[PDB]
C-alpha cells in the first residue's frame, strides 16, 4: 500500500488571470514543491531526487511546463465563450499505486469546483457519474482530440511514476521509516460549561498514536478526543480532554510505536 502522487490547484479568476500551485507527495508526506515562476521542482529533501539524474528531472519539469502551457491555454480558450463560469478552481491528483507482486496501478483524477469531474481509467477518460454535463463534454475532447497527450499521460502515471517512486522509497527509506518519540504534557483549563484536564502528545512520528486517561489501571472514557494534527517538522500532535470535578489518582497514557512496548505515563498533581 505505497503510493506517489502530484497535486495541482488551478485557480481561474478572470479571462486574463489564472494561477497554479503544485506538489509531490509520498502518502501524506510532501516530498516536492513547484516554483511556478521558473517552472521547476522544489526538492524538499536530500533524497527527494530519488534515483533520477538532473537531466531526467530537467525533462520532467519541461514536460510539466508543456502540460501547464496547453492546459491553461485550452481552458482560457473555452472559457473565453462564457465569463459567468469565472471564478472557478480545477484540481488534479495524478500518480501511481504500488502492490506486492501485483502490476502497479496508475491514477489521474480531476475535480471542477470541489466536485469530481473526470478520471483516467485504462486507456480512456471516464466522466464522473451523474455530476457533470461538462464531464461528458470534456471527456469527448480528451478521448477524440487529445489521443497523443492521453498516451503520454498513460506512460507517465504507469511507467515513469513507479520507476520514480521505487527509487524515492529506496532513497528516503530512513526518513520515511524513522521513529520519533512523543513529547507529552498535561494542562488544565476551567470547564466553561467542573474542570478540563488536557493531555497533549506532540512531535511523534509516524501518525498512529493512542492517548488515554487512566484512573490507576482503569481506562477512562475521554470527554473530547482530538484529531491528529500536523507540526511543521513532519511530526504530529494529539490532545485528549477529560472533564473532572475540581482537584488525585489520574494519569494519562501515551502509546506509540517509537516507545517500543513501554507507554509514557503522566501523573496529575
Amino acid at each position, epitope marked *: 500500500h505505497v503510493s506517489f502522487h502530484v497535486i495541482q490547484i488551478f485557480s481561474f479568476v478572470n479571462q486574463s488571470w489564472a494561477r497554479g500551485q503544485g506538489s509531490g507527495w509520498l502518502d501524506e508526506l510532501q516530498t516536492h514543491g513547484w516554483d511556478s515562476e521558473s517552472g521547476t521542482i522544489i526538492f524538499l529533501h536530500n533524497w527527494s531526487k530519488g534515483n533520477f539524474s538532473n537531466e531526467e528531472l530537467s525533462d520532467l519539469e*519541461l514536460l510539466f511546463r508543456f*502540460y501547464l502551457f496547453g492546459l491553461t*491555454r485550452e481552458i482560457q480558450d473555452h472559457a473565453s465563450q462564457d465569463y459567468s463560469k469565472y471564478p472557478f478552481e480545477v484540481q488534479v491528483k495524478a500518480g501511481c499505486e504500488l502492490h506486492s507482486g501485483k502490476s502497479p496501478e496508475g491514477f489521474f483524477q480531476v475535480a471542477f469546483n470541489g466536485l469530481d469531474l473526470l478520471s483516467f481509467q485504462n486507456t480512456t477518460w471516464v466522466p464522473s457519474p451523474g455530476c457533470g454535463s461538462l464531464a461528458q463534454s470534456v471527456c469527448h475532447l480528451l478521448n477524440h482530440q*487529445y489521443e497523443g*497527450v492521453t*498516451e503520454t499521460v498513460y*506512460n507517465l502515471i504507469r511507467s515513469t511514476c513507479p520507476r520514480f517512486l521505487l527509487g524515492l522509497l529506496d532513497a528516503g527509506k530512513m526518513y520515511v521509516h524513522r521513529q520519533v518519540r512523543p513529547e507529552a504534557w498535561l494542562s488544565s483549563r476551567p470547564s466553561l460549561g467542573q474542570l478540563l484536564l488536557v493531555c497533549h502528545a506532540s512531535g511523534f512520528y509516524p501518525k498512529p498514536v493512542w492517548v488515554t486517561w487512566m484512573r490507576n489501571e482503569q481506562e477512562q472514557l475521554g470527554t473530547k478526543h482530538g484529531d491528529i494534527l500536523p507540526n511543521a517538522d513532519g511530526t504530529w500532535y494529539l490532545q485528549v480532554i477529560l472533564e473532572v470535578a475540581s482537584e488525585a489518582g489520574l494519569s494519562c497514557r501515551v502509546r506509540h510505536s517509537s516507545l517500543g512496548g513501554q507507554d509514557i505515563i503522566l501523573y496529575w498533581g
Partner: T-cell receptor
Amino acid sequence: QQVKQNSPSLSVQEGRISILNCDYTNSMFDYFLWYKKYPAEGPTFLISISSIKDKNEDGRFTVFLNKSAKHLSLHIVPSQPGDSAVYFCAASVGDKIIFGKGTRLHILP
Amino acid sequence: AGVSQSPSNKVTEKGKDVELRCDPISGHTALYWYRQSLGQGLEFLIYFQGNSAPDKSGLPSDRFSAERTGGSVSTLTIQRTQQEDSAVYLCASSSYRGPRMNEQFFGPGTRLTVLE
C-alpha cells in the same frame, strides 16, 4: 547527442529489406518518430511509436522499440526506388524533439 | 497551404543582414527552427511554445536572433552573414492536439549561401 543514428549511409537492392537503426540515451523520451527527406524538399513524417508500444506496422513500414536497449529501428519491406531519401529518427519528451543526424538510404534498382 | 518559408534561396555577400520567414500551419502552437549544413544533419536552432522562445540554445552566435511576435509568423535574422552560416534553414510547426505527439510539418527550406 541523445539520439544517435550511426551509419550515415546505406545501400539496399530494390526488392529487399531496408533496416534503419537508431539509439537514444534519454530515459525520459516517450515518443519516437521517423521522417523521410528528399533533396530540395523538407522532411516529411513517415511513422511513429509511443513508448507504450514495442512495434508499429503501417504498410511496408515497421518501427520496433526496445526500451531496455534504448533502440529504435525502421524496416522498409520490400524496398523500392522511391525509398531513396535521408531518414531521420526523432525522440521527444513534452515539446523537446531531438533529431538524429540522418541516414541516406540508396535503393539500387 | 502547409508550412511555408521565404525566400526559397538566398545568395548574399559576407557582411549583409539576412531575414528568414516562416508561415506555420494556422493553429500550430509550436514553431521550430533548424539548419542543414552540407556534410551534416539537422542542427536545431530555436523553438517557440506560443509567442515565447523556451530554447534559444542552438543559436550559433549573437548575430542570430528569432522572433514570433504573432505567435504565428516567425522570422530568423542573421546579422553580418559569414561563410559558416551557409546552410538550408528549415522551419517546422506542430500542435498538441491529434493522435501523434510532436508530428512536425516542415517547410520547403531556405538555402542560404554566403560568398566572399
